């Protein structure tokens, strides 16, 4: 059945999951109560949208999702919200006390109380799957739950599910968008703890989406809702191949094999085009070749960095909507002629492509205008190391003076785990330099 189980951890992951499953329902015609009139396969079926939704005998399409947060405020809104009966009570897990921006509390202290319960609920969803393909894990780097509990969950999932695919969607912190002083520590600790358990991680620099929303959509002062709705477009493009039937779509295994050249180098740079308001979309259409070119403009990346100063190692271009192969092949042909777009010399063939003819969908309320052709590019570029460097520097400034470290030691951690995690990051930075060097 090729099912995929989504796991949303912490405020960011939960709230990002709210925008994704809202979009999914709009793309599949699922009502807030879960009823799907267009589905005649009542109680089950082998349809492509069943990879993300399970069916009940009463015609209820239930997300294959688990929501976990160490405090109940955020998920409580889901329990009383407009999609309250879309999910099952067992799928919405909450504690009483949060991790307090502390990785250690999310991983060791408050996390342990709830981790065994979370695995059991994930287990319950797995047993309903005939051919579970992998896990999607949405979380922030900055929060204590998103960093500490996610790390705990990823380690436990590797034991209970072995090498089964685990993909992340990670929110890289930024001062613009409600960050905290200790978030660099949490980002480094969770990255190091998760490096060896994640097969492909999709970072989203919250500063980048803040800028895109503030520039492309003319939103003076973006909100989390504005950002999440934009993130959901990228998540939808990546999972469209799995939720819809099609002859030219990219499943997860196909997706990971063509984008990750080495196990540790698994942080693709996401872009989406077109991101445009209704006022600009009025009397204006963009073509396949136009949105393909926009994917290589650093101004549209989901993570702030300069691909022009780095090297590409693999590009995945997921087209959707009114897109024809002939235009796709011509647009990609142009990119290969551009000497401004340099591939490593060990990547002679570096484009994975796909098309999902289902048209892009807009939330009724979401600042994005409804377009007819959209493309999401995911490129493994060395430039992404710039994001690691920025975060590593902030880690060094605080850690040199051991600022805030006592909050982590008080919860049972040792300073050795800080330096070990930092050394792993140093190796990763050197790894990105090594893969970018020309061959002999």
């Amino acid at each position: 059945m090729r099912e995929c189980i989504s796991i949303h951890v912490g405020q960011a992951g939960v709230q990002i999951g709210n925008a994704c499953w809202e979009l999914y329902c709009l793309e599949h015609g699922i009502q807030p109560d879960g009823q799907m009139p267009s589905d005649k396969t009542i109680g089950g079926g082998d349809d492509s949208f069943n990879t993300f939704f399970s069916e009940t005998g009463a015609g209820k399409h239930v997300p294959r999702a688990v929501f976990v947060d160490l405090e109940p405020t955020v998920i409580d809104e889901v329990r009383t919200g407009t999609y309250r009966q879309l999910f099952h009570p067992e799928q919405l897990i909450t504690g009483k006390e949060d991790a307090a921006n502390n990785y250690a509390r999310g991983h060791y202290t408050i996390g342990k109380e709830i981790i065994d319960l979370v695995l059991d609920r994930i287990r319950k969803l797995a047993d309903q799957c005939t051919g579970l393909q992998g896990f999607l894990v949405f979380h922030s780097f900055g929060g204590g739950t998103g960093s500490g509990f996610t790390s705990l969950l990823m380690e436990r999932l590797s034991v209970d599910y072995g090498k089964k695919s685990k993909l992340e969607f990670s929110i890289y912190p930024a001062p613009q968008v409600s960050t905290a002083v200790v978030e660099p520590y949490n980002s480094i600790l969770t990255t190091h703890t998760t490096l060896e358990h994640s097969d492909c991680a999709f970072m989203v620099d919250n500063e980048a989406i803040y800028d895109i929303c503030r520039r492309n959509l003319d939103i003076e002062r973006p909100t989390y809702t504005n950002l999440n709705r934009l993130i959901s477009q990228i998540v939808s493009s990546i999972t469209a191949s799995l939720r819809f039937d099609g002859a030219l779509n990219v499943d997860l295994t196909e997706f990971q094999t063509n984008l990750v050249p080495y196990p540790r180098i698994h942080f693709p740079l996401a872009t989406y085009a077109p991101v445009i308001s209704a006022e600009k979309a009025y009397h204006e259409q963009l073509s396949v070749a136009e949105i393909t070119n926009a994917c290589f403009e650093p101004a549209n990346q989901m993570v702030k960095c300069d691909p022009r100063h780095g090297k590409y190692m693999a590009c995945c271009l997921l087209y959707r909507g009114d897109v024809v192969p002939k235009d796709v092949n011509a647009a990609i042909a142009t990119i290969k002629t551009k000497r401004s777009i340099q591939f490593v010399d060990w990547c002679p063939t570096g484009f994975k492509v796909g098309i999902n003819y289902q048209p892009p969908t807009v939330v009724p309320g979401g600042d994005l205008a409804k377009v007819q052709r959209a493309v999401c590019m995911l490129s493994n570029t060395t430039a992404i190391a710039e994001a690691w460097a920025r975060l590593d520097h902030k880690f060094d400034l605080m850690y040199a003076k051991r600022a805030f470290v006592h909050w982590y030691v008080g919860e049972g951690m040792e300073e050795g785990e800080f330096s070990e995690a930092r050394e792993d990051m140093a190796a990763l930075e050197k790894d990105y330099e090594e893969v970018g060097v020309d061959s002999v």
């Binding site: 090729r2 024809v324 002939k326 060990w346 002679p348 063939t349 484009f351």
Partner: protein
């Protein structure tokens, strides 16, 4: 009673094979239900080669449909001729191959391979005199490439004395949609070099150029490209499916087309006055493989003309092409260009010609893949996906060595003299 067992694996294999059964079903005048409604008895004289005769005079292809992804099965079953096929001959998995050759060849495909051979045994044992097998598949993916060559290796164990043909879509020089295709192609070629008697090299970039530059289709699709490939597949097998002045099978074709066992990779062509067909047919612009014939010499050539046409006119025109451009033919294989003619033309055409060339120029293709393979393998790029399924680097080095040895062989006979 020289039956052929058809097998198609992967998306490409099934999409191309499905269109192939549409083409010859029209040529033999068989409708989707599998009942004959044609005009000439020559459509049936040799029908048992590709079809089984079922109760009620319904005709069922000796076709076996394989994939690790069930999606392409459903497309076939719902296509124009979807209900022709035997339901039990759909052998599919649920996992897919993920463009990973090792998954198709060692793990995911190994789980399903026995089920496919069981269907082969049914079909083969129901044959008066099994002649051989033909496979349609891509080399750049994981199922058709990885599991396809695994099926070939298993079939040769059960049927070591039978002929194995393949129609292999090869990686194109500039158009690609698979990052790891050099790894998948090189691993497959090393299998094909050993366990196939004949391999037709098909290049999608050339097919696309024909559809766009020649046929003037502004938006070519895989359907258009598959139609060209299916038209060539029908043209190649015309002598096996229809009677005429030539009474030959697959083994005779291999015996006369392959002067050296490893050099059995052919360059197909298709055309479109009799003089103008033979002019087209030898043109680089009409070659299905992405290699210039002028960059080599033909070891052997086979040309098949279809439709009511002056035989003497074809003989004179063919002989003119040989004598006119004799510098592109090996001098030590006397009379290495043979021609056959069939009275039955294809649909919507009065005259047609199919080309089969065993040209040394095909080494250019194996050069390309080798250089692409080495660039990735030197740095072990993407390799962890293959070692994670249990492969060792030495198996990659062996394939690199063999394809380079194959390239070395082709250059040998491209400069040989009498």
């Amino acid at each position: 009673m020289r039956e052929i067992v058809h097998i198609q694996a992967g998306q490409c294999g099934n999409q191309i094979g499905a269109k192939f059964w549409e083409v010859i079903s029209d040529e033999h005048g068989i409708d989707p239900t599998g009942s004959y409604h044609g005009d000439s008895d020559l459509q049936l004289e040799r029908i048992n080669v590709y079809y089984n005769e079922a109760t009620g005079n319904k005709y069922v292809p000796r076709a076996i449909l394989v994939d690790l992804e069930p999606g392409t099965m459903d497309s076939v079953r719902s296509g124009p001729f979807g209900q022709i096929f035997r339901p039990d001959n759909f052998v599919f998995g649920q996992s897919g191959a993920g463009n990973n050759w090792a998954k198709g060849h060692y793990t995911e495909g190994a789980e399903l391979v026995d089920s496919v051979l069981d269907v082969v045994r049914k079909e083969s044992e129901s044959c008066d005199c099994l002649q051989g097998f033909q496979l349609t598949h891509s080399l750049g993916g994981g199922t058709g490439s990885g599991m396809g060559t695994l099926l070939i290796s298993k079939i040769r164990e059960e049927y070591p004395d039978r002929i194995m043909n393949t129609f292999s879509v090869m990686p194109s020089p500039k158009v690609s949609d698979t990052v790891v295709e050099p790894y998948n192609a090189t691993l497959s070629v090393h299998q094909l070099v050993e366990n196939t008697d004949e391999t037709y090299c098909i290049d999608n970039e050339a097919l696309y150029d024909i559809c766009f530059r020649t046929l003037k289709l502004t938006t070519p699709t895989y359907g258009d490209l598959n139609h060209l490939v299916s038209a060539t597949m029908s043209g190649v097998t015309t002598c096996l499916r229809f009677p005429g002045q030539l009474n030959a099978d697959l083994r005779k074709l291999a015996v006369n087309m392959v002067p050296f066992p490893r050099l059995h990779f052919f360059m197909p062509g298709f055309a479109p006055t009799v003089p103008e067909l033979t002019q087209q047919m030898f043109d680089s612009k009409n070659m299905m493989a992405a290699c210039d014939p002028r960059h080599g010499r033909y070891l052997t050539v086979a040309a098949i003309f279809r439709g009511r046409m002056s035989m003497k006119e074809v003989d004179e025109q063919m002989l003119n092409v040989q004598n006119k451009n004799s510098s592109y033919f090996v001098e030590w294989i006397p009379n290495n260009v043979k021609t056959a003619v069939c009275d039955i033309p294809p649909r919507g055409l009065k005259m047609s010609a199919t080309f089969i060339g065993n040209s040394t120029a095909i080494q250019e293709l194996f050069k390309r893949i080798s250089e692409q393979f080495t660039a990735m393998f030197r740095r072990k790029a993407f390799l962890h996906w293959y070692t994670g399924e249990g492969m060792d680097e030495m198996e990659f080095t062996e394939a690199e060595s063999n394809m380079n040895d194959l390239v070395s062989e082709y250059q040998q006979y491209q400069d040989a003299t009498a």
